[PDB]
């Protein structure tokens, strides 16, 4: 087109094409779902099929615990996500040292968005091709917080958001099944909803779904086999419906 | 060969023939400027500028084409006005620094060398463009009268008579004729008359014009650069008109 | 067509010896409104026609005061105009505070030429695209300067720049001797300037909201009339 | 019997050469007809005349405008020359342009020769078709009698051809056409290597080389080079330099 | 010709060549001026052809021979702006060497320093080579008469006798023939005037033309100082021979 | 005379042949993609109204906040890219707090708008000679409202070009043209706070694709007595109901 | 700046960056042609005047004052082994109006060529009044042309949808038609052009003269349309002064 | 902004190859042939001293330079690059090892430093890769004799015998057919002379051949006498007379 070879060039219709290309790179990776419950948050992630000769003991977790009350998931490029996670953890510890108060979810999301924005202000750097979902609870109440951050530096607040490849189907399923008027009161309902949403695009739910649960008072419990139990129960209920 | 495609979009690029085309384009821009000439008499230097009669709204007092660098240095230029003005400012700074250091007026060859170095330094990088002005300057120092001309490439030479602008060529011929008519020497007043004659001969373009003549001589101005007064200016104009 | 290959930056000369970016910056002047300046012997007056985005918008501040003895009117790009106005204010304050001396009009013109010539020879910067009309009074009397953003300053009795300024310039040149001898009566000079700027109007007339006047003089500090203040001058 | 078809290429050297060809000797060239331009970005412009003061190529006095795709005819030597102003729309419409516009023109006038003028940028030589960069110009020839059913043969010049180049598709469509003329005998291809800029002198030298090589059978030598008046407006206004008194002096 | 990004900077062509350096070499010979350098028993002589096609130009202001220091003289082939730039750089380098190491700079070390600067120019993308060829002549206290030459490519080497310019091949061939005839590799004259006369005669024979006092520029380097001969001295040498 | 591509709109520091900067125009085109934001300043205070254009039903209502509090006496509305607007808002808040610290007085709205325009001018030369800090100009347009003793209630429109205007009623966004026309035809100095709010709601409903409701419509006010505040959903719903009642009869 | 990037070299400007129709750049096959369908119930003979222009000239045709009404649309389709756009046609008084929306990003010139050919073919049956309003980026000042006189300078020319319409009127299949064309200078790509206040005023005055309306009300409405955040003005108020 | 960085001059081709490094290798292969062969009690380095118009002094310009008293190097490619690399290598040998451990560095570590410098050159957006290939011959107490080849990319390899430049393939074949595990220094010198005789197009005398040896210690070249522990240089350069005498003999 001629207006897509730099990040500092505006297109005649008013678009920045490099940001769109970064978003396209994001939409190439594995899916990632974040669901907000009444008093809990659930992060689901899709793992590609594990090879036979791959070590499963120390395989990385798609959900990274930034702090004892804040967790992060990503979609896009893995190494850029590692860099962003390292910076976020350093910033959280620095803020805790400076102000004696652990970071809030919104503050950390804003810092991540600011880093991603700063990495778009020069022609000699490549912006991170990562879209992040930040979940947690502010360390003074029981209000769940879920945020989505994009490569351009834009951060938004959501109740149930999916990012990654084939995210349209999961987004439609969440829209047709999740109601903000009556969010899942218990953790089990939210986990089941997340698993069912992920199953719409995952070929095999026994070995390609990862579930993490965040609850108030900075608990954060990652589910192990239990995901297999949820998948089997969902299949049984679906066959009963049939 | 006057248009070298592929090797003319950057300042510091050699063409396959070994030529810098930005410098030659600056020379072409110089060739479209106003005609300015300079003559060297026995003990002085005379500068002449053919200026175009602009609107009468301009103040005829504070508008002077010939630039003054130092009390013993006169300078004219042809090309782009901002570049010539900046070069004159740099020359003034250099002369001030030399006089402040060594307690004497700066000799003309040293001033010419410093100006040439400064101009040449602008043909070494692709982030700057060469000056689009050719500058004829001169003065009087302990060794006598000196007249120099400096090109956009940073090359300068000492001339018995120098001419630049649109009507340079014929003017140069006239200057050569001057050397063929006064080989032994020339006085300051004769130099002023001949400068007026050459300017009148070489301005045949048409649009009325005006003439500005300045001189710096040891036996006429005590080694100082002064503009020609009204009586001698009118005498030179009348002589130039009568010669045609 | 061949011009399109040599108009990328201010470092490139055409094969015919041209600097097209500076030419485009000069051509950017006519996109602005018309301002007129004139002085006879003791007072200098600037007249400006202000423009608005629509009915509900305010009017552009054509004339900005630089110092008690110096002001200017701008015609062209707003960012460059603001930058140069702030630069001139800083230069006047710097001269007064450091040298214990009021900045001269010619010195201000030289400073503007020095600042403008730099952007026409170095990569990475855009040339200024605003012309300026500066009026001042100093120990040498009253002075009017026209500053061309290519880096040029001219001293003249009167001039006008902007859109449709040719008619005003022709009127000023034709009647040069009429107003050049107006001494001691600033009102006549202001009225002459208003009449001059009225010649550039096209399907429009001067009103109380789109006319601004600036006056400086020997015993008169630089002042600006706008709104009802110019209602007496129509 | 010989057709000249310029291509929109780097520096517009062929097209400018066409302007060099027609306006150098306007006595022997006259306007013939405007072809269909549904595959172009066709424009509307006034007539063009030689600078030396000769009669315009458009003999008819009832036409005051001009189109993009036009064909001029030389009856003294029977040469058809095509002129294009606007570039071809996209690159996948070359086939339609060949098989629906110039295809009827072939065998419409029984043309016995095709000549294709092209300029190649040496930087974008992805396939390395250039083997001897010592020379600047190149010539290739192809005969239907000596060949049955890359495919060209090149003289000892600077340089096979790349599949991505338009010349390859032109040759493929010309040879593979089921509506090809029966009088088409010889195809010749002149190419030049040059950069982008003021290519007036480059175009003149390219035309000089073409005339010297006698690629066109009935191409007379040119003794005086005259530019069209429109080239006086390439840099803009004729007196634009005089306008900027504050900038030039 | 070049093709690609290797037209404005110094990077390798697909054939492993630096085109900008070669074009600078081409630019060196655009002055159409030939120079000669010959070392005697206890002196060194450089003679440069002087052309004044314009009679409006002052002959005394035309000079390509420079005095770098007390003992070192330099001759430049190429445009005069880069010549003067290189002259100033050489003067600064020689003075700094004397200040830093406590003794005068020999010719070979200065030539190597300039060659290293040229190498910097040829490797850095944003710097361009100087289209000039430099010839340093001196009488070193450890090596006797010395002539060294450096080029835009960053290559420097010493010569028994050297010639440069568009017509350097004929002068070089004549010098080689003279050396083969004599087989002493230098000039047997014990006076610098005789060496200057020999160089003048050799230049006249090689170029096939006769010069006046204003058509030559002569510089002589001795053990103590390097000095440029004036018009009267050249005229006296011409009258002698 | 041929059709060739022109590249005068690529570089920010490049003039068009007539002397225009197309990057600022493209930034305004980008601003036009934002949601509609309206601001009406009357003698009883200033009213700002925005549309919470939710791309997804699950998006949080409080996630979209295009009306901020620069200071207790200065409110703002934004249209365009949110990333640049965040930095602009932070800089405006910092300037206001610094002015309060060093002067013990509220900053005039005109001063703050001038400061924001000086920040937006950073893509070129700075106002005080400061260097460049932005590779591209901003893509956000701001409507700044405030109250002070010097000029009563002030409303300003600030552009990425660095030039700001003073408006009685200004609307910019996706439906900028229609809202601006309605403001031009339906504004008077006798408008009260309630009338201005109802006019804002009616214009928003006119320029909104979906049905008007407090979910996608945020209204804020700034007055001398109560500073800057933002109406909640209940009050906006009551205003919408009253508007429906008055439009019915 | 210390330097500019070595690799910042612009691409050749011989080929435009027009939108792609088919992703196969090596198809070596005939490309499909867009199909245009003109409404069969427009009742052309009921109207004796037709105006052909683009969307940028919308302020020249106020809606309420001229009583614009909708009749029919032109349907353009294309199949690639998918492009479809709607072209509404307006009517004020007894005069029809065609206002095509140019977009060099998403709309190829081939659609414009087909639309122009269809419109010229349909309107040539009855030969009504033909008025052409458009802009060209190669003209110094405003130009007025008729079927007999060409006021364009030899370098100046007209390209685009207006250029296609003029080409079809002059050398198209239907010839002999009488038309008046008004061209104004502009800058910018197709579909995103910008004008100046003087050019807008001149266009408004000439359009009012050629349409027969009172200058006062017509000028007021046109100015109000221009200043209401019209895309043609751009940032004249925000960038200048 | 656009002034605080420069784009990388060396980039990967779509095939997975660095074009600048390949072009530097091509430039090296166009240079004069330089060879090196290792014996059981020494290493031999040889090269051809190509000259300009026969008026220059060939002794002034030396293509074989002493890096350390026990380590020497030769090059094929561009002269100024070799000179700059030699100066930097001597400075690095003194700074990194002599001023730290009191000893000159071993051959492998100096070769590694040179390779690191060249690799940093190939990874820069302001300079092009070097256009030389280096044959470095050295001796150290704990590794005996060693010969290494360093490429413009910064890759160095050990060699029993090798050659670079124009006549490299033929020289490699000849050395492969000639080299044996029981070779001695004199036999290595003879084989090197035979290999050079097949590549020189002009006069094959001592004035156009540069030869150096890493043999035994040379007390006569030390410059002082009195310290039995101190040893003379292990790097020696053969004079023109010695080369001529070897040429006349076997």
Strand line-up across the major sheet of chain H = 8-1-2-9-10
DSSP E strands of chain A, number: 10
Number of helices of chain H: 6
Q: Summarize the helix and strand pattern of chain A as letters.
A: HEEEEHHEEEEHHEEH
Give the H and E element order of chain H: HEEEEHHEEEEHHEEH
**Any idea of the CATH class of chain A?**
Alpha Beta
Biggest protein-protein interface?
A: D-G, 47 and 43 residues
Class based on secondary structure composition and strand pairing of chain H: alpha+beta
CATH level-3 fold name of chain H = Glutamine Phosphoribosylpyrophosphate, subunit 1, domain 1
Query: Helical stretch count of chain A?
Result: 6
Can you count the beta strands of chain H? 10
Strand content of chain A: 15-25%
PDB class: hydrolase
Keywords: proteasome biogenesis, Ump1, pre1-1, cryo-EM, propertied maturation
Entry title: Proteasomal late precursor complex from pre1-1, state 1
Chain A: Proteasome subunit alpha type-4
Question: Overview of this structure, please?
Answer:
This is part of a larger assembly, with 8 protein chains of 8 kinds. Chain A is α+β, with helices and mostly antiparallel strands. Helix content of chain A is 36%, strand content 21%. Chain A has helices at 17-26, 78-99, 105-118, 167-177, 187-199, 226-241; strands at 32-36, 41-46, 63-67, 70-76, 130-137, 144-149, 155-157, 160-163, 209-214, 221-222. In chain A, the strands form 2 sheets. A 5-stranded antiparallel sheet of chain A has the order 8-1-2-9-10. Chain A has a 5-stranded antiparallel sheet with strand order 3-4-5-6-7. Chain C has one domain (4-234): Glutamine Phosphoribosylpyrophosphate, subunit 1, domain 1, CATH 3.60.20.10. Chain C contains 6 helices and 10 strands. Chain C starts with 19 loop residues before the first helix and ends in an 8-residue tail after the last strand. Chain G has one domain (35-239): POC1 chaperone (Rossmann fold, 3-Layer(aba) Sandwich), CATH 3.40.50.12120. Chain G has helices at residues 63-66, 109-123, 161-171, 197-211, 215-227, 236-239; strands at 35-37, 49-54, 69-78, 83-92, 95-100, 129-136, 143-146, 158-159, 179-185. Chain G has an 8-stranded mixed sheet, with helices on both faces. In chain G, helix 2 (109-123) packs across helix 3 (161-171) and helix 4 (197-211) crosses helix 5. Chain G is globular and about 60 Å long. Chain H is of the alpha+beta class. Chain H has a single domain (1-249), classed as 4-Layer Sandwich (Glutamine Phosphoribosylpyrophosphate, subunit 1, domain 1), CATH 3.60.20.10. Chain H has 6 helices and 10 strands, in the order H-E-E-E-E-H-H-E-E-E-E-H-H-E-E-H. Strand 3 (43-46) of chain D pairs antiparallel with strand 8 of chain G, so a sheet runs across the interface.
Secondary structure blueprint with pairings:
This is part of a larger assembly, with eight protein chains of eight kinds.
Chain A (H helix, E strand, L loop, with lengths): L16 H10 L5 E5 L4 E6 L16 E5 L2 E7 L1 H22 L5 H14 L11 E8 L6 E6 L5 E3 L2 E4 L3 H11 L9 H13 L9 E6 L6 E2 L3 H16 L1
Antiparallel strand pairs in A: 1-2, 1-8, 2-9, 3-4, 4-5, 5-6, 6-7, 9-10
Helix pairs in contact in A: 2-3, 5-6
Chain B lengths: L20 H11 L4 E6 L2 E9 L14 E4 L2 E7 L1 H22 L5 H13 L12 E9 L2 E7 L5 E3 L2 E4 L3 H14 L6 H15 L6 E9 H4 L2 E4 L2 H14 L1
Antiparallel strand pairs in B: 1-2, 1-8, 2-9, 3-4, 4-5, 5-6, 6-7, 9-10
Chain G lengths: L34 E3 L11 E6 L8 H4 L2 E10 L4 E10 L2 E6 L8 H15 L5 E8 L6 E4 L11 E2 L1 H11 L7 E7 L11 H15 L3 H13 L8 H4 L2
Helix pairs in contact in G: 2-3, 4-5
PDB class: hydrolase
Keywords: proteasome biogenesis, propertied maturation
Entry title: Proteasomal late precursor complex from pre1-1, state 1
